[PDB]
Amino acid sequence: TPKDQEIKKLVDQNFKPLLEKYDVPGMAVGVIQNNKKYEMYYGLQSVQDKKAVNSNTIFELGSVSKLFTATAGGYAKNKGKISFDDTPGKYWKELKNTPIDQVNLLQLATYTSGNLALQFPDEVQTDQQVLTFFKDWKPKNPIGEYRQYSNPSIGLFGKVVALSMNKPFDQVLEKTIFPALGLKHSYVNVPKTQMQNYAFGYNQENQPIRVNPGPLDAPAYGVKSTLPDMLSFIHANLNPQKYPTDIQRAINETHQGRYQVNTMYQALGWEEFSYPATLQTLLDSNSEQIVMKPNKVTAISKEPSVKMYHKTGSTSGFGTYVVFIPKENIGLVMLTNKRIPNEERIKAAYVVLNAIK
């Protein structure tokens, strides 16, 4: 059986049934193995337009956007534009000598400020309102010791990275970072000329929806991409030595674990695990306790030789999951235009990656 057919059968066995089960209109599943890419598309990018999911379909990546933010930070750091020991007021001057200026960039990127929640308050929308929010911020938990997954936190990180590179964040990605990764159809703002390819997302009643604009949206959850581009991103993560030095260092920077919450190593954007990882480890990483509540972090006291990495993402109408394993030279991308439980993403990817010859 040709290998493309093997992978396809595995994807059919493990991902395709999720479509019926969860009433998901459209799915794109990609596998890369030893630098060969395999693309599988199912269903519709727009139900009402009867438009099939295909290689040009653009999907909302949700929190997988944090991976690009992390990469941009890695790029800026390794070009000497920022140091992770800096504080935000060095760059956003209006924050100099305010309480948030006691939190360093690494802590912002990895969610350990000790007082930032998942979202900004709903009324925070404009740039002035974002500025005021951070001007007015006060500490709670000891800085650097507690992880609380947060959009504002990595949002501010991204904003500071953009300031350091003298360009708005959407330009850092569209003009620097996407091109450096060789991505040709990845966007912060999808242009009118590509809207025809932008999937509808579908909410829990299968009503068509797309992401709402939000404060510091772009670095937190605001990237949109295609299956081929995400495969290319995974390839870059699997093979950073094949890229020019500035982006190579940036990609490597994102793989570095910074602390642990039990079995989960928090890298920049990516989550990291000792490899081989059991399924339960991977599922534990996206438990309610990890994702929604604060957890005291521990210093890494066991650094494994071999790791794997993953990240989930959801917007209101989309799901994403990306995973890669350097030792096995393998990775997988799932994109859907409806959310499905993260545990079903992880398990299906687990089964497929462990069964591939």
Side-chain angles (χ1 to χ4, degrees), residues 1-8 10-19 21-127 129-183 185-191 193-301 303-356:
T1 298
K3 227 281 210 294
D4 57 350
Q5 283 190 237
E6 193 217 330
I7 291 177
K8 165 68 157 142
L10 283 174
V11 171
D12 285 353
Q13 285 171 337
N14 291 293
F15 285 84
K16 183 182 173 183
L18 305 169
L19 305 172
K21 183 174 173 182
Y22 296 97
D23 199 9
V24 180
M27 182 186 288
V29 180
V31 170
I32 186 176
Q33 176 186 38
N34 292 323
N35 302 318
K36 299 217 174 165
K37 294 176 190 167
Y38 303 93
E39 304 171 13
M40 296 128 301
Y41 305 104
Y42 301 91
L44 303 170
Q45 81 170 62
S46 166
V47 173
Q48 69 195 72
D49 304 305
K50 308 174 179 143
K51 185 30 225 140
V53 172
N54 74 89
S55 63
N56 298 308
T57 302
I58 298 169
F59 289 93
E60 295 176 357
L61 298 177
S63 290
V64 166
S65 308
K66 300 175 174 62
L67 307 185
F68 293 104
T69 303
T71 299
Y75 184 82
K77 186 262 193 185
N78 284 284
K79 293 199 68 177
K81 304 299 193 184
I82 59 173
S83 156
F84 291 160
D85 292 322
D86 298 334
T87 58
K90 182 174 207 207
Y91 301 94
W92 203 347
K93 302 289 192 195
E94 289 81 350
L95 295 181
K96 203 182 203 164
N97 301 129
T98 62
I100 194 83
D101 201 30
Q102 297 295 286
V103 179
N104 65 40
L105 307 186
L106 186 53
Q107 289 165 341
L108 291 174
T110 59
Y111 326 114
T112 60
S113 72
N115 195 27
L116 287 172
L118 179 58
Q119 311 287 1
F120 286 101
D122 309 324
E123 77 165 1
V124 175
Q125 294 294 335
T126 67
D127 297 299
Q129 288 182 303
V130 171
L131 180 52
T132 297
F133 177 87
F134 286 126
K135 285 190 79 175
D136 292 347
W137 183 94
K138 280 190 242 317
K140 186 172 81 78
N141 287 62
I143 293 167
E145 293 185 12
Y146 293 71
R147 187 186 186 280
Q148 166 143 68
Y149 188 57
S150 178
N151 294 327
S153 186
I154 199 174
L156 183 56
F157 177 78
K159 183 169 179 56
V160 164
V161 164
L163 288 166
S164 80
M165 276 166 85
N166 301 306
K167 286 209 273 235
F169 184 85
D170 69 296
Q171 299 292 303
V172 172
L173 293 195
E174 296 180 344
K175 300 295 189 169
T176 303
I177 299 298
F178 296 157
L181 292 160
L183 317 179
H185 291 292
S186 297
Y187 305 101
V188 169
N189 300 299
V190 175
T193 59
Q194 278 286 325
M195 277 293 275
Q196 61 170 179
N197 289 322
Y198 189 166
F200 285 112
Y202 287 86
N203 71 6
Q204 294 316 101
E205 296 109 297
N206 282 60
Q207 297 288 10
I209 192 160
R210 297 192 173 109
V211 70
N212 289 325
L216 312 182
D217 49 8
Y221 54 75
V223 171
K224 298 103 193 180
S225 190
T226 69
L227 185 73
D229 269 16
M230 294 306 292
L231 279 173
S232 286
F233 184 54
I234 301 309
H235 167 269
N237 278 272
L238 287 162
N239 301 285
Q241 77 282 359
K242 319 304 200 209
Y243 286 76
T245 192
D246 293 343
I247 199 66
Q248 175 180 160
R249 289 135 70 145
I251 295 157
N252 288 315
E253 188 76 48
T254 72
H255 296 174
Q256 296 322 295
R258 315 290 169 159
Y259 56 71
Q260 271 162 263
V261 184
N262 193 33
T263 52
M264 185 185 80
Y265 298 78
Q266 181 65 67
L268 283 183
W270 296 101
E271 308 165 8
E272 165 183 46
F273 310 97
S274 179
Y275 182 89
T278 60
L279 180 54
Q280 193 60 53
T281 295
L282 304 173
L283 297 180
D284 278 344
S285 71
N286 284 264
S287 79
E288 293 253 52
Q289 168 76 32
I290 301 291
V291 176
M292 295 297 307
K293 288 158 145 192
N295 298 277
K296 204 166 177 285
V297 309
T298 49
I300 295 165
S301 60
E303 169 64 354
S305 168
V306 55
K307 290 94 155 176
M308 65 174 287
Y309 300 85
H310 80 182
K311 183 74 195 82
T312 62
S314 313
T315 57
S316 53
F318 288 86
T320 316
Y321 179 65
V322 295
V323 56
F324 74 97
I325 310 159
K327 184 223 164 56
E328 295 304 304
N329 212 3
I330 201 170
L332 175 154
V333 174
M334 186 218 69
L335 308 176
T336 55
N337 65 354
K338 185 185 174 180
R339 285 175 168 183
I340 66 171
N342 286 332
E343 47 267 40
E344 296 269 42
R345 312 180 199 176
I346 296 163
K347 184 173 74 161
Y350 190 91
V351 175
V352 172
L353 293 171
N354 287 291
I356 289 169

